[PDB]
Design a protein around this ligand. Sequence first.
Ligand SMILES: [Ca+2]
Ligand SMILES: [Ca+2]
Ligand SMILES: [Ca+2]
Ligand SMILES: [Ca+2]
Ligand SMILES: [Mn+2]
Ligand SMILES: [Mn+2]
Ligand SMILES: [Mn+2]
Ligand SMILES: [Mn+2]
Lengths: 237, 237, 237, 237
Amino acid sequence: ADTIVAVELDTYPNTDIGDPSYPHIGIDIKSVRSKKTAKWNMQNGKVGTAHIIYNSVDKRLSAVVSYPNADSATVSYDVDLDNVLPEWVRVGLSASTGLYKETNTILSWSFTSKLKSNSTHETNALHFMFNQFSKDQKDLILQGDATTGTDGNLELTRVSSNGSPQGSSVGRALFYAPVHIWESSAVVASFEATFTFLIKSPDSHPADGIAFFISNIDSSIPSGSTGRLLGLFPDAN
Amino acid sequence: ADTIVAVELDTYPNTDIGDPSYPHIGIDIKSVRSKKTAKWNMQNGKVGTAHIIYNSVDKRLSAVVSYPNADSATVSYDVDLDNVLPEWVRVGLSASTGLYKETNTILSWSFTSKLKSNSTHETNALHFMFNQFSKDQKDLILQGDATTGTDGNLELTRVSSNGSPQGSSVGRALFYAPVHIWESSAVVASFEATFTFLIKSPDSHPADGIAFFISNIDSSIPSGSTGRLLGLFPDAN
Amino acid sequence: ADTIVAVELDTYPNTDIGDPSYPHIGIDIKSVRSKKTAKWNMQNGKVGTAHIIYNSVDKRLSAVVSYPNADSATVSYDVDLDNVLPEWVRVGLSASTGLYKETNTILSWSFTSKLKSNSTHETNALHFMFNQFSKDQKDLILQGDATTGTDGNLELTRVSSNGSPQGSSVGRALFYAPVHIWESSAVVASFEATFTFLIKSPDSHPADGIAFFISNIDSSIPSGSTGRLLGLFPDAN
Amino acid sequence: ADTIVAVELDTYPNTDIGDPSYPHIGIDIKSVRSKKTAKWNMQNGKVGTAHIIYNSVDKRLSAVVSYPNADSATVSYDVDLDNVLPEWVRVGLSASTGLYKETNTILSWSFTSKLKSNSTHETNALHFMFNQFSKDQKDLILQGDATTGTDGNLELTRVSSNGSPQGSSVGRALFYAPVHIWESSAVVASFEATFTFLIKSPDSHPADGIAFFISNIDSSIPSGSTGRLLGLFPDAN
Ligand SMILES: [Ca+2]
Ligand SMILES: [Ca+2]
Ligand SMILES: [Ca+2]
Ligand SMILES: [Ca+2]
Ligand SMILES: [Mn+2]
Ligand SMILES: [Mn+2]
Ligand SMILES: [Mn+2]
Ligand SMILES: [Mn+2]
């Protein structure tokens, strides 16, 4: 039902469904089986940063993930989003845990989209930036186990009182306002997203990951999408 | 019921309710009877621009209106918005006509709000800019007679096929996402709004005006607020 | 001597040096002989808009040129600017006339460059926007025949009192501050430029064109670069 | 000679020249004897943040300084900068030490100035943001003992190898490009500056302070302005 385009930070290798045998970043177009992936040297307990960029002229979705003092990981995929997504969409973050677990903490999130028309100086834009989340964040649609306010952070999946991450959890956060990514008179459409995250697990095998995604405006968590499905897909096809 | 703070571009002098005897700009705090006004040399048929600014440190709401090749008009009022408005609000534009009429056309509208916390680099922001409006503008809540899409403009009040403005009309447009204007750890909160408009009337006496306003999130047009009430107030108290 | 990367809006076809036989837009890397070009339906006397974009992840320089009510023209070229340009550069606009002529008027110009480091939230940026130019524009380095202030515009090449464009003219405008386009710890570097122009000629054959360019910081107009050389190259190799 | 407007973070009370008997923030208009001050609970060794704002409509220069987990300090002063400063100015940071000392480390610095003209959509802007400084920062004019690059920070005054601050030191950093703060057709001019700093001293009595300042473009450090004069004034009048 839902149309999903996402950049996944996959912490657990499910080789039975196409994941490489190591943590990786990937670009998912309507399927959890990434169209392209790159090895990611994930660091348990460290704050990392992900940057996602795209523009309608080049038609290439690219993402870069890094941690301080370390080399980055990058992945790119040629795709025309006009042919995949509706004209109006919502953007958000999703995460899940299953048998294995980890905290999926978001410390900041910014997004900027621009539509440049052929009229002189005619440019439409939307920009939001969160460097702190409140208990009652009215401009976010929280789904599943996601909550905001703990230490000013956004916890996508369940975490107990003692800070311990729970398994079989799924949660998403979408920006309240729909986003216009295509318009008939637009000559250039582009967006850039950045978010900082903290994945921590008491185990040697963290799971399952975090994903930045773009979807139809009325998207909701598919049934049974905990674990390897990242709260984004109904199955592994 | 609704809590309204607005900057009015009042084209018709209703001296019976406190308006000066000439077109004027004014600052309205919960009442159509402006707390402060300034003479405005309105130009029928010309595109004008209004700028509104405010910050929590100075606690002064100021507005400047101008037309190309002409001197500007300015008005300021000392007011602490924390004591007038809720923590979360919606921002919008409103206009009305009555026995007398005019077109209340909006050609562009931008808004920027910022909340700077005491945490290092911790800043929250929201910014939107419309230089063109579509027939289906999903990020705007249109109320009353307001419509978008005609020539790429936002028509706040009714205009016939031949471009002729109708009387007894009222319409408003609010940005979809609520806006956070106060937070317990914020050291500075501020906003700036800019919109360009075209007020045109076939008559020597245009009415009634356009207003930029901030209100509780669930604000709706009060009954009988056409004409002198600008689609904002239930009465003239 | 100078290192030049430029996007040319070439109004005169010099087929003897590789130009296609029609006005065109092209990407020039250290040579006036464009690495790639696209047909451009230039409109004499109309205000057009050019958009240029690039990022270090995709390594693709793309440009889009359009006029109101018309289809756009686009050109892209895969090039790693890190391998062509120095770490610090200046950005500017250049234009020329020769035997044939045209006005090379710039009405607005904006530029944004960003360097995102691997440190958390660590981002460096520079942004400038001119929608009007003054007689004494201290933040611009004017070279050759370029002047600012006439009607608030930037005239890159000589125009007489009666508004008539002169031949054999060359002029450039560079932003005063050097721009940092590469840094050892940067994970993503990108820039976007936009400018609106008005090319008008009394003749059926306008020449020679306008170009947005990036160069070493101490770049100056090469001798004899009027005409087909666009004020950028010392010869046609 | 120089014309100086500055916001001082004064760490040492020189009661003989008008300082209150405690660390304080103040607004200086052409004299080190602040026109207005406010008590500042300075924290040795902690990273603080200063915000400075001003607009031509309200004509009020305000500043807010804070540290994480602490209440802020604010100071405001009504002053028309058009009557004090030239049309073109440079903005910068200055610091000094004398008999007593402290490190005057700047970790980030951002600035935004806007000039809104009466022409439709006509707005000029300049914005820069440094979250990291390089050894060779070509867009900064360093004066005196100021250096960049150590740990990616800007050290305004001398610090030895072991990180120990030196006395009798003075240094300033100005942004390379001049800034336009007034224009004949501007209806609103405004600026906002933010910088984070780390003042650390091995002594119970740190000195002398840091100041954000605006000056004529060719401003240089006055002779003998170490110590209480903050590298800004030639004497204490
Ligand atoms: Ca997986
Ligand atoms: Ca009235
Ligand atoms: Ca040519
Ligand atoms: Ca002192
Ligand atoms: Mn995967
Ligand atoms: Mn009134
Ligand atoms: Mn050519
Ligand atoms: Mn003092």
